[PDB]
Amino acid sequence: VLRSVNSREPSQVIFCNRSPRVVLPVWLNFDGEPQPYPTLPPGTGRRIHSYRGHLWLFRDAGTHDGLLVNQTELFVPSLNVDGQPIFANITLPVYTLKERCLQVVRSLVKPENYRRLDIVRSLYEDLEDHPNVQKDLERLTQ
Amino acid sequence: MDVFLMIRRHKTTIFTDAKESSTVFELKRIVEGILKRPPDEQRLYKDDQLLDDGKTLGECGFTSQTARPQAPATVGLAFRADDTFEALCIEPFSSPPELPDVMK
Amino acid sequence: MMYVKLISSDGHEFIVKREHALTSGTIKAMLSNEVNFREIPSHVLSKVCMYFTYKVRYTNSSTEIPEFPIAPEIALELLMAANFLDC
Numbered sequence: 001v002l003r004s005v006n007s008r009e010p011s012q013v014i015f016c017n018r019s020p021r022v023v024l025p026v027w028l029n030f031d032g033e034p035q036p037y038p039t040l041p042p043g044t045g046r047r048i049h050s051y052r053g054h055l056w057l058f059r060d061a062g063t064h065d066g067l068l069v070n071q072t073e074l075f076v077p078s079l080n081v082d083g084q085p086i087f088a089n090i091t092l093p094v095y096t097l098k099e100r101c102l103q104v105v106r107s108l109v110k111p112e113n114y115r116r117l118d119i120v121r122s123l124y125e126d127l128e129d130h131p132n133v134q135k136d137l138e139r140l141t142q
Numbered sequence: 143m144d145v146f147l148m149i150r151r152h153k154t155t156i157f158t159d160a161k162e163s164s165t166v167f168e169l170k171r172i173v174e175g176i177l178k179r180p181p182d183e184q185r186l187y188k189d190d191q192l193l194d195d196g197k198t199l200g201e202c203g204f205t206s207q208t209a210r211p212q213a214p215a216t217v218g219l220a221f222r223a224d225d226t227f228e229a230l231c232i233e234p235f236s237s238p239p240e241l242p243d244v245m246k
Numbered sequence: 247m248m249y250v251k252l253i254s255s256d257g258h259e260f261i262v263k264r265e266h267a268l269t270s271g272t273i274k275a276m277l278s279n280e281v282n283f284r285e286i287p288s289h290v291l292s293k294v295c296m297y298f299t300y301k302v303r304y305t306n307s308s309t310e311i312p313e314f315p316i317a318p319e320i321a322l323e324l325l326m327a328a329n330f331l332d333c
């Protein structure tokens with residue numbers, strides 16, 4: 001259901017990483033599979049060639065935490081007016097306090113040891129249920 | 143520009159914001175609204191330094207890039223009982239326990 | 247402006263805008279002007295209040311968003327408070 005359209009009309013884009021994370025761009029191909037692209041260090045930019053109708057999302061390359069692009073989940077290159085490229089502004093979301101705590105705890109505890117933590121069973125489940133692109137593709141497809 | 147503050151006395155801590163261009167006296171009026179004590183019964187401090195009423199929060203070093211929403215600057219508060227002012231006392235927050243083994 | 251008072255397990259009294267404390271559905275039910283938290287100490291509840299200020303400031307704003315900082319020593323306890331308060 002969620003997939004790029006094989007339009008064949010070029011569209012130049014600037015990927016601008018305004019987050020403190022290492023960024024992984026992901027293109028959804030014509031069969032809807034996620035294809036990973038080269039990463040962007042924090043604060044850096046890249047001029048890239050894409051196409052109208054194509055779909056992109058953006059993640060933390062290390063943890064897969066979700067990121068926003070022009071204030072939303074998905075980015076679709078549009079028609080270039082006057083030769084100017086489209087701007088893709090990649091930023092941190094305002095995570096809930098709970099999700100931000102889970103990030104920090106995941107980054108300090110090896111996954112084999114989550115069960116040793118002195119917390120209620122459902123938080124162990126929340127820790128093991130880490131961010132992942134397929135999971136989100138289901139949800140967004142809904 | 144907004145500055146984000148904790149105003150602290152004893153075991154009391156107020157979270158609020160104010161303009162960089164606003165005055166010390168104006169902050170006392172805020173405190174007055176919340177704790178019901180007039181400006182003449184209040185002293186405000188930055189660390190150990192007493193603050194003058196007519197000076198801006200900016201002049202006294204509270205700037206938008208140091209007094210941040212997620213990490214606000216502390217302003218000390220002392221009250222006058224009867225004739226004289228108590229000394230500045232700010233109760234520290236609790237200590238975190240040791241990191242569990244699995245987090246080391 | 248309307249304020250409420252949130253009190254930690256060790257007796258620290260935090261005074262925040264009512265709008266900000268309603269960030270939490272659990273706090274909303276405990277009010278509906280003071281709330282006592284018997285399980286949350288001051289080194290955790292102070293950070294909770296800082297999150298309210300951060301969320302309200304940076305929700306729906308295009309000015310680049312900075313990372314909300316959490317020291318390793320307080321992370322486990324803050325997680326449990328966040329789960330209880332649903333925030």
Ligand SMILES: Cc1ncsc1-c1ccc(CNC(=O)[C@@H]2C[C@@H](O)CN2C(=O)[C@@H](NC(=O)C2(C#N)CC2)C(C)(C)C)cc1
Binds near residue numbers: 008054
């Ligand atoms: C250098 C870099 N850093 C971070 S991302 C990045 C980077 C590196 C290389 C590219 C090259 N462009 C592409 O791969 C674009 C992106 C996406 O729109 C798909 N794509 C294509 O060229 C795709 N081509 C096409 O759809 C068409 C062709 N040809 C039919 C028009 C294919 C070859 C992957 C099927 C784009 C971005």
